[PDB]
Amino acid sequence: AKCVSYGVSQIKAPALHSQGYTGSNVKVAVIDSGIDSSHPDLNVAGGASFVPSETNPFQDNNSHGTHVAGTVLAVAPSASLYAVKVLGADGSGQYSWIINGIEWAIANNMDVINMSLGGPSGSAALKAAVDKAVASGVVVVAAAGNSGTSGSSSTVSYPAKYPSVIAVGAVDSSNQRAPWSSVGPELDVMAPGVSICSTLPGNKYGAHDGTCPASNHVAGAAALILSKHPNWTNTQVRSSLENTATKLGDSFYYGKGLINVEAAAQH
């Protein structure tokens, strides 16, 4: 039944909830596989599809974007989620689709973009779009990737790897890096990403593992901070999260450490 992530307490969102800050009026674009807006535990504020063969962003056959929505709302329950569908049934999207998604978020005045997606390769056009979003004042959050460690190599995927993006890696209930959490100098912060229980299509609930759930907590945290400091820039929101993180291990593996949204929202 009504599953709340252990990660909501781990990042200290309850401190903000009890001050009456729950991400009210903050527009968050979930750029992903869609959101089952059927689910009676989710609010969805609107959406768009850039998958040519799947015009419905409110149908989630992959079941990924529905899980993403629940975790963002578990952290920021009165945020306005927008279902920006850029991934098809095979679980991938063309760069053009993802870019159309980012352009859509810019044109429709999103405060936060969550990208629980990545590839091994970037494009000039993807980097341009992401940089443009951040230049226009959008907080852009992305999953660091699930490619683990690879000796001395960065394994952080695009677009998390871009400096303009907040790359999020995954820890468990003990603040230990998940072994599949991508690593490298481009990694910014960590959040819970192991057995994260959230909403699934058809009024269901279930655990997922990944940097996807980790980034969902950070996107929610951005929404809480802007709830309380509506006049903060994306720059100030990003600084608050990075400078107040609980230091864990070396920054190659853990970046700045675990986000503390309570500490971030005083800063």
Numbering used by the authors: 1 to 75, 85 to 276
From the paper:
Crystals of variants containing a Trp at position 189 were only found after a long incubation time for Pre-4 (Ptl-M222P/L217H/A225N/F189W) and Pre-5 (Ptl-M222P/L217H/A225N/F189W/N218D). Mutation S218D in Pre-5 is involved in the S1′ and S2′ pockets but has no influence on the structure. Variants Pre-4 and Pre-5 crystallized in crystal form C containing three protein molecules (A, B and C) in the asymmetric unit. The structures of molecules A and B are highly similar with an RMSD (root-mean square deviation) of 0.3 Å. They have oxidized cysteine and an unoccupied active site like ligases Pre-1 to Pre-3. In crystal form C the structure of molecule C is more different with RMSDs of 0.6 – 0.7 Å to molecules A and B. It has an oxidized cysteine and a bound eglin fragment (41′-46′ (SPVTLAG P5 -P1′)) that was used as a crystallization aid.
Omniligase-1 is a broadly applicable enzyme for peptide bond formation between an activated acyl donor peptide and a non-protected acyl acceptor peptide. The enzyme is derived from an earlier subtilisin variant called peptiligase by several rounds of protein engineering aimed at increasing synthetic yields and substrate range. The final omniligase variants appeared to have a very broad substrate range, coupling more than 250 peptides in a 400-member library of acyl acceptors, as indicated by a high-throughput FRET assay.
